[PDB]
Design a protein around this ligand. Structure first.
Ligand SMILES: CC1(C)S[C@H]([C@H](NC(=O)[C@H](N)c2ccccc2)C(=O)O)N[C@H]1C(=O)O
Ligand SMILES: [Zn+2]
Ligand SMILES: [Zn+2]
Length: 241
């Protein structure tokens, strides 16, 4: 059993598949978890989502690596056996975009914030093949997110990074904060090296206001939590100003 140094542990309702862990969150939503083995430190878990939308599947975030991301695709093939229409990746760091080449090799259409695509080559990442753009209030421009089904993409403002985006799952009470949101018991906001410490608090609160009726908040490095993940993250971020 993988026991990560950073990230949630395995509990009841988790399926180990190869090097990854999968957890069903709703009838049509699963969390994927992959692990970066840091020598002398141990495993760092990172989470994304898999959403079934009728006869097709949608993915939020890659795993840390191409091979792990190919394992996500293998899990989808075994457990769902429907084609992946597209993936949305939530900023230009390894935990979220490290596996782009596996998605591209599989022929899956990839989407990211235009700014993530512009930053990708500066972050040792491969850009997504399509760029999302956003309104002044953070909502994605719908012409840039064709046929996204239940994925409702929201740019909350700079926080964990300047490019971080978030995703609500319409038809459910789930919203995904990626690395912007930390859980209600977290002591740290994680890596602030690329963060906007001035705007972080407002960006965390904007995510909450964008999906005001989401009761299950999914994030990169903890198990799904209540809305207290949002409010606690914002309270920690208030201390940065
Ligand atoms: C879990 C992290 C502290 S590391 C991860 C990310 N870092 C990477 O993906 C790096 N490539 C990395 C380098 C060394 C060890 C682990 C990750 C970041 O900088 O936001 N997201 C951070 C976070 O979400 O706070
Ligand atoms: Zn990051
Ligand atoms: Zn992260």
């Amino acid at each position: 059993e993988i026991r990560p140094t950073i990230g949630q542990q395995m509990e009841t309702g988790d399926q180990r598949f190869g090097d990854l862990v999968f957890r069903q969150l709703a009838p049509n939503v699963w969390q994927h978890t992959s692990y970066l083995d840091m020598p002398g430190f141990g495993a760092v878990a990172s989470n994304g989502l898999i959403v079934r939308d009728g006869g097709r599947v949608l993915v939020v975030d890659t795993a840390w690596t191409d091979d792990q991301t190919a394992q996500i695709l293998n899990w989808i093939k075994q457990e769902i056996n429907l084609p992946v229409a597209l993936a949305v990746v939530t900023h230009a760091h390894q935990d979220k975009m490290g596996g782009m080449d596996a998605l591209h090799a599989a022929g899956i259409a990839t989407y990211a914030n235009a700014l993530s695509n512009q930053l990708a080559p500066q972050e040792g990442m491969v850009a997504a093949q399509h760029s999302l753009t956003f309104a002044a209030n953070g909502w994605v421009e719908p012409a840039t997110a064709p046929n996204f089904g239940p994925l409702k993409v929201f740019y909350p403002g700079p926080g964990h990074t300047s490019d971080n985006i978030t995703v609500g799952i319409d038809g459910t009470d789930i919203a995904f904060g990626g690395c912007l949101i930390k859980d209600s018991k977290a002591k740290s906001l994680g890596n602030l090296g690329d963060a906007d410490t001035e705007h972080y608090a407002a960006s965390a609160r904007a995510f909450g206001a964008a999906f005001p009726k989401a009761s299950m908040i999914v994030m990169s490095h903890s198990a799904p939590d209540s809305r207290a993940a949002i409010t606690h993250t914002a309270r920690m971020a208030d201390k940065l100003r």
